[PDB]
Design a protein around this ligand. Structure first.
Ligand SMILES: NC(=O)C1=CN([C@@H]2O[C@H](COP(=O)(O)OP(=O)(O)OC[C@H]3O[C@@H](n4cnc5c(N)ncnc54)[C@H](OP(=O)(O)O)[C@@H]3O)[C@@H](O)[C@H]2O)C=CC1
Length: 162
């Protein structure tokens, strides 16, 4: 149960759809890590995603709609439901990409955290959700910088104690 998403100084993530910043290093590493695994995505995501479903990977959709049909990915509407699936898949890992409400649900049921804090300060209508930082301990931290001062990101890891 790990979360993977991009954000700015304001903690942003998207602009009424998704990350509007061109982060090639994020995508490349994103797919390089989500290879042969399972990624959970929100409703607005599957519809507001540029790569739906993601190639060479296992996609997972999370929408309230009961009659929702997501071809190529797994469909569910409850937090407990999808959890049963993840259990049935002991050969894969859980990776949350979006949306904001999705991270919230697992926010409590989460174990690992992976965030990319950009350097530039952007403004939108979608910010990250609160998390129990105390209950989570930083596993790793790497500050990556590019030619552009705004293209500088920081990769941080977090794992719940015990
Ligand atoms: N930087 C990034 O990687 C990403 C950034 N973003 C940004 O964040 C914004 C929000 O994410 P987006 O993908 O659009 O949002 P989603 O609608 O996909 O995710 C949140 C919504 O999913 C539904 N949902 C969440 N948890 C559950 C649950 N346990 N059971 C059932 N339904 C659930 C709810 O639907 P509702 O309440 O609609 O009924 C909730 O409002 C995007 O518009 C974009 O700007 C989005 C994706 C990735």
């Amino acid at each position: 149960t790990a979360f993977l998403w991009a954000q700015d100084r304001d903690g942003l993530i998207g602009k009424d759809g998704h990350l509007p910043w061109h982060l090639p290093d994020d995508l490349h590493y994103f797919r390089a890590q989500t290879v042969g695994k399972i990624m959970v995505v929100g409703r607005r995501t599957y519809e507001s995603f540029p790569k739906r479903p993601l190639p060479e990977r296992t996609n997972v959709v999370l929408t309230h709609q009961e009659d929702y049909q997501a071809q190529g990915a797994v469909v569910v509407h409850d937090v407990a439901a999808v959890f049963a699936y993840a259990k049935q898949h002991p050969d894969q890992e859980l990776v949350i990409a979006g949306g904001a409400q999705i991270f919230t649900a697992f926010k409590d049921d989460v174990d690992t955290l992976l965030v990319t804090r950009l350097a530039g300060s952007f403004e939108g209508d979608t910010k990250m959700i609160p998390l129990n930082w105390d209950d989570f301990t930083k596993v790793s931290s790497r500050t990556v910088e590019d030619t552009n001062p705004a293209l500088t990101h920081t990769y941080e890891v977090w794992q719940k104690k015990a």
